[PDB]
């Protein structure tokens, strides 16, 4: 089988991924690394494709190694930005047969949410995102919410900004500004991963909400990317381009 | 201006519609009828197009009159079914220049909801609709929710039904069966018009929710249908075909 | 330690309970039974207290055995009714030192929900319950929702029923009637255990919502009942009487 | 009848209040002032009690005049803080027969929410507030949400703060800090007034949500305060002390 390594194998999501890869008939687990394991275990193990669920502070280093070594990468780790994507692209120039796919959410409901928010955005005066996650999460706002806001922003190019009469305010009250879209981050015990996109116009609102109750919700999207990763050399952002929508 | 009558002119929505028509520059109010006003006021007033927000028990009678008299109709009244649509179509055979558009929801957020539910349906194991409305509403479930469920059902043709292990149950607990989609109707003081489409699969859910807080949310969709009604001779169901999506 | 048996040890909740009991310092696991294990394993093992998470069809039989044998019981299995409570009480007449506590929800958020719904009920014209659970659930509506509705009903004794103009309806649309409170049951893949109590009056609504994302949310309530079970001889319904509120 | 003035008589809420006072049998409208009307109209009209729904920038000036002139005040205008309350108290020292009641929310569902959040707070590891309002609102976060967070904070005195691993963050992402409670403010077309208090602990969350769909929801609370205002000389904060809970 296709030889698959996992980075972050002891994390909440990574350990789930290990089980998934092990269990898949067509995939063979070549490596399971967590913090402090050297990356050369991947190359020693003849790994073809790596799944990465680590931490924002280490993921670019992992990618740089993967790409130099011709190893395809399916990355779920967040903390990405346009500059980090440009950087990944620039490393791939040297390794034009290597495929990297980076997605802030592998759960189909979250992918659909982003696609729908994009379609809905131009019909409303106002748009915001609220995201809600467990309180072990390193990054705020979430990768999914940041990507969602950019999509909405892009789709509302040439329309007026959100109306807002706010004239007196506590700092941080109105959330983070992501391309003119307010984005709010709740961190709460009991939660896993959640987001509500909110649109408003006269007398009405539309809410597009996603809930991952279990980290098993990330598995199908990941395995799909792993199995299809070689079709798209270079960088793919998001799961959406592997789907027919 | 285009001569516009309103049926149900004293109702919650109709009275709003009267104000909207009166206020539009390009539209002239030809008649304002409520219960007990004869329909010939419409023809006496040379009405070209009628807006109908009445009651399920009277709307087919109104339509029969409109159609016989060559009067275009934009209908928001609910209580429609496939058989009532066939009937309307059959009356239109005799009056092939008359346009009728019937839509259970004129608010853009609700239209988008239906379009999105249609797109989302095949990705999930489970789908349900919950609708919530003020407690003066004659019909349950709502027209919007019934239409939404049929769309979902249509889109999931050839997939397995919703899983459900329910083996002991109070009657009505699992909602109404609309083409295999459970549909639940809340009737609550304080509400206006609300719906949540819910989809589920392993470890995740997607919720598509619409809220009309004010009956002003129905106005743009109605005025758009009124202004475009003559482009589509015959019967149009829903606002979606007048939109680019 | 206090000797604790579990019935339903292989179920979703029971297996969690086994781990919890095993892990507690002050509790000793005396038995782990699932379907087809004879109940005399409990008495052979000198079990003092049993935790029950089985099925509505078997729980009364289990209770009858526990009570005859003087074994205290902390029951989470649902499907209970006033008649089943009377029956349990009637068996306890013969064994007046035996304590039984039966609770449809051991999660603190659900307990609080019930207490709050009770306090809120008399301020509103309208009340409904919607509950949403995984699609392996045998019973609809849920035990928590049924108990919640009775509490609300009790608290609204002598007030008018929910207003409702519904004059045309699909069967089951308006939910199950629990003491005049509409109760609706969603069964959806991705879910665990969820409920929203809804109250309405002029221009406003109040929603009290609980989500158990993980079955670990039932553990503290159970262990608390297990450790305190002997303080209340006879039958206790709900976790609320063990709490200060 | 009791002579009642309204400040902010042309605003969204004030105009509703004017209608309510006019319509009440036991209340006589003595004045209707909006921006630019001199306050001496109140004293010329022999006003006994004033209802204030104006703007944060003017309300303290209005109160100073009311209090100097011995006129009781029922204030819904937000923008209040502990220092503004101390100030109001200090003015009342000189006029010890004058009653002032200041409440950030007059709708019963919002009052109940605050009372419930207070009761719930000590059972959870985490608490946040999200508030959502129309985009004409001057202040963020809302008065109701700020008061709610202080109540929660007070109730969690001596417990650990909300857990949060956030190590990389966009500014404003985590909301405003109100006594250690994250508070987030959505401003969206279509909205009126909305709030969700969120509590979390292991595997579970509790959400207490309020929606005012219409400004009529503020009327009963206001009229109740107006009719009872003389019972409590001095300053009352909130509607809760006029209710039995
Ligand atoms: N794209 C998606 O669908 C999803 C993305 N995420 C994102 O994935 C990342 C991880 O999430 P969780 O599993 O919750 O975090 P986690 O903290 O549970 O696990 C991360 C694991 O990575 C390990 N690690 C740290 N440095 C490493 C290194 N240099 N090499 C190998 N392993 C290393 C850690 O020791 C830890 O075991 C986060 O950035 C999160 O936002 C999380 C869930 C779904
Ligand atoms: N498509 C959409 O966007 C929407 C549809 N609706 C639907 O529209 C209908 C009316 O809703 P509301 O305005 O809430 O009801 P409503 O009860 O407030 O008003 C209906 C009005 O129709 C009048 N009426 C009854 N029989 C009549 C007749 N034979 N001719 C003329 N007028 C007559 C009534 O006296 C009343 O004033 C309902 O079926 C409702 O479900 C409501 C809101 C939006
Ligand atoms: N009170 C509370 O907080 C909660 C109550 N529940 C209720 O608890 C019950 C079980 O829930 P789940 O664990 O989801 O169901 P489940 O189906 O996962 O597990 C039930 C287990 O009981 C076993 N069982 C059946 N008959 C038995 C017998 N005669 N003796 C011993 N074991 C037997 C089954 O084989 C199965 O392994 C349900 O009635 C559910 O509604 C569930 C979660 C929380
Ligand atoms: N406590 C509660 O239940 C509620 C409180 N509010 C709060 O009440 C206030 C007003 O809310 P809205 O009615 O939405 O605002 P609004 O902007 O619709 O109306 C405020 C009115 O006050 C007038 N005004 C301004 N300065 C004035 C002055 N010096 N004297 C007399 N009138 C003056 C304005 O011209 C305007 O017509 C806000 O601070 C809002 O947050 C709003 C709703 C409910
Ligand atoms: O968009 C994100 O950052 C995201 C998505 C799903 C899960 C998580 C997580 O658990 O951190 N984070
Ligand atoms: O789909 C429906 O039936 C519907 C939609 C919007 C408003 C109403 C209503 O107020 O009755 N009904
Ligand atoms: O009230 C109930 O019936 C209930 C409560 C929590 C979990 C479950 C379940 O998983 O079935 N059922
Ligand atoms: O707490 C608040 O600030 C509040 C409460 C209700 C309505 C409004 C408003 O419309 O501004 N503001
Ligand atoms: Cl995507
Ligand atoms: Cl449509
Ligand atoms: Cl309880
Ligand atoms: Cl209060
Ligand atoms: Na494998
Ligand atoms: Na006009
Ligand atoms: Na133990
Ligand atoms: Na009056």
Question: What is the DSSP secondary-structure string of B32-92?
Answer: EE-TT--THHHHHTT-SEEEE---HHHHHHHHHHHHHTT-EEEE------HHHHHHHHHHH
CB B133 within 8 A of CB B192: yes
> H/E/C letters for each residue in A204-232?
EEEEEEEEECCHHHHHHHHHHHHHHHHHC
If DSSP codes are grouped into helix, strand and coil, which group holds residue B124?
coil
DSSP state of D133: E
Q: Exposed/middle/buried for A96, CB within 10 Å: 0-12, 13-18, 19+? A: exposed
Q: Exposed/middle/buried for B182, CB within 10 Å: 0-12, 13-18, 19+? A: buried
Q: Exposed/middle/buried for C36, CB within 10 Å: 0-12, 13-18, 19+? A: exposed
B106 in a known ligand binding site: yes
* φ, ψ (nearest 5 deg) of residue A226: -60, -45
D150 Cβ contact list (under 8 Å, min separation 6): D178, D179, D181
Which of D66, D59, D52 shows the shortest CA–CA distance to D81?
D59
Q: What is the dihedral of CA D200, D150, D139, A206, to 10 degrees?
A: 20
Q: Exposed/middle/buried for A237, CB within 10 Å: 0-12, 13-18, 19+? A: middle
Alpha-carbon C12 to chain mean position: 15
Counts for chain D of helices (H) and strands (E), in that order: 7, 13
Other CB atoms within a 10 A radius of the CB of residue D242 amount to: 18
Q: Give the DSSP H or E segment for A19.
A: helix A12-23
Give the dihedral sign, CA A55/A58/A60/A66: negative
Provide the strand spans (E) within C62-125: 72-75, 99-102
Other CB atoms within a 10 A radius of the CB of residue A70 amount to: 11
Distance CA D87, CA B15 (A): 48
CB B207 within 8 A of CB C130: no
Angle (CA) C31 C32 C34, round 5°: 135
Distance CA C41, CA A94 (A): 68
Does D133 participate in catalysis according to the annotation?
Answer: yes
- Helices A56-68 and A82-93: angle between axes, nearest 10 degrees: 20
Which of B27, B28, B35 shows the shortest CA–CA distance to B8?
B35
Angle (CA) D169 D171 D172, round 5°: 110
Other CB atoms within a 10 A radius of the CB of residue D35 amount to: 12
Q: How far is D168 from chain B (nearest CA, A)?
A: 27
Token pair listed for D126? 């985490």
Distance CA A72, CA A46 (A): 12
Token look-up 């086994």 returns: C18
Gap sites in chain C (C to N > 2.5 Å), preceding residue numbers: none
Chain D contact set for B191 (CB, 8 A): 213
Does A194 participate in catalysis according to the annotation?
Answer: no
Token pair listed for A82? 């346009």
Distance CA D53, CA D226 (A): 14
DSSP state of D96: T
Which of C231, C244, C229 shows the shortest CA–CA distance to C103?
C229
A56 in a known ligand binding site: no
A162 in a known ligand binding site: no
Token pair listed for A162? 């959100």
Other CB atoms within a 10 A radius of the CB of residue D157 amount to: 9
Q: Exposed/middle/buried for A34, CB within 10 Å: 0-12, 13-18, 19+? A: middle
**Region of C190 on the Ramachandran plot (φ > 0 left; ψ -120 to 50 alpha; else beta):** left
CA atoms within 13 A on the CB side of A186: 31
CA of D207 to the centre of ligand 11 (A): 17
Angle (CA) C183 C187 C193, round 5°: 80
Distance CA C35, CA A173 (A): 54
* φ, ψ (nearest 5 deg) of residue D211: -135, 120
Q: Which long-range contacts (CB under 8 A, 24 or more apart) does C10-16 make?
A: C10/C34, C10/C35, C11/C53, C11/C54, C12/C136, C12/C215, C13/C53, C13/C76, C13/C215, C13/C218, C14/C51, C14/C53, C14/C54, C16/C215, C16/C216, C16/C218, C16/C219
Q: Using omega within 30 degrees of 0 as the cis cutoff, is the peptide bond preceding D141 cis? A: yes
CB B7 within 8 A of CB B52: yes
DSSP state of A156: T
Parallel/antiparallel/unpaired status of strands B176-178 and B181-187: antiparallel
A84 inside 8 A of chain D by CB: no
CB B245 within 8 A of CB B111: no
Q: Using omega within 30 degrees of 0 as the cis cutoff, is the peptide bond preceding C141 cis? A: yes
Token pair listed for C150? 């009775």
DSSP state of C171: T
Q: Give the DSSP H or E segment for D146.
A: helix D143-155
CA of C143 to the centre of ligand 7 (A): 7
Q: Give the DSSP H or E segment for D6.
A: strand D2-7
CB B34 within 8 A of CB B78: no
Token look-up 């009653």 returns: D99
User: By what technique were these coordinates determined?
Assistant: X-ray
Other CB atoms within a 10 A radius of the CB of residue B135 amount to: 18
CA atoms within 13 A on the CB side of A104: 26
Q: What is the dihedral of CA B183, B189, B192, B193, to 10 degrees?
A: 0
Which of A29, A22, A24 shows the shortest CA–CA distance to A4?
A29
Most informative mutation of A9, A39, A53 for ligand 1 (most atoms within 8 A of CB): A53
DSSP state of D166: -
Q: Give the DSSP H or E segment for A151.
A: helix A143-155
Which of B11, D40, D136, B238 shows the shortest CA–CA distance to A200?
D136
CB B73 within 8 A of CB B50: yes
Token pair listed for B194? 């609300």
CA of A188 to the centre of ligand 9 (A): 25
CA distances from C58 to B101, C36, C72, C77, C86 (A): 55, 11, 17, 9, 17
Which of A6, A140, A31, A149 shows the shortest CA–CA distance to A78?
A140
Q: How far is C35 from chain A (nearest CA, A)?
A: 27
Tell me the resolution in Å.
2.4
Give C182's strand partners: C177
CB D149 within 8 A of CB D183: yes
D197 Cβ contact list (under 8 Å, min separation 6): D113, D116, D117, D120, D127, D128, D129, D148, D152, D207, D208, D209
């Amino acid at each position: 089988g296709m030889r698959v390594g996992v980075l972050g194998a002891k994390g909440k999501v990574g350990a789930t991924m290990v089980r998934a890869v092990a269990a898949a008939d067509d995939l063979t687990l070549s490596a399971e690394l967590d913090a402090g394991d050297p990356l050369s275990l991947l190359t020693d193990g003849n790994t073809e494709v790596v799944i990465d669920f680590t931490h924002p502070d280490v993921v670019m280093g992992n990618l740089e190694f993967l790409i130099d070594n011709g190893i395809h990468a399916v990355v779920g780790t967040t903390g990405f930005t346009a500059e980090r994507f440009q950087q990944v692209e620039s490393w791939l120039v040297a390794k034009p047969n290597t495929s990297v796919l980076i997605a802030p959410n592998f759960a189909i409901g979250a992918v659909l949410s982003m696609h729908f928010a994009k379609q809905a955005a131009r019909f409303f005066d106002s748009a915001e995102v609220i995201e809600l996650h467990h309180p072990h999460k390193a990054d705020a706002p979430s990768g999914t919410a940041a990507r969602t806001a950019k999509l909405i922003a892009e789709a509302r190019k040439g329309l007026p900004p959100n109306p807002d009469a706010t004239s007196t305010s506590l700092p941080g009250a109105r959330g983070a500004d992501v391309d003119g879209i307010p984005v709010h981050a709740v961190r709460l015990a009991g939660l896993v991963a959640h987001q509500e996109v909110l649109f408003g116009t006269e007398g009405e609102t539309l809410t597009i909400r996603h809930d991952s109750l279990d980290r098993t919700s990330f598995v199908p999207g990941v395995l799909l990317a792993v199995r299809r990763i070689a079709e798209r050399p270079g960088l793919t952002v998001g799961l959406e381009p592997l789907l027919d929508l």
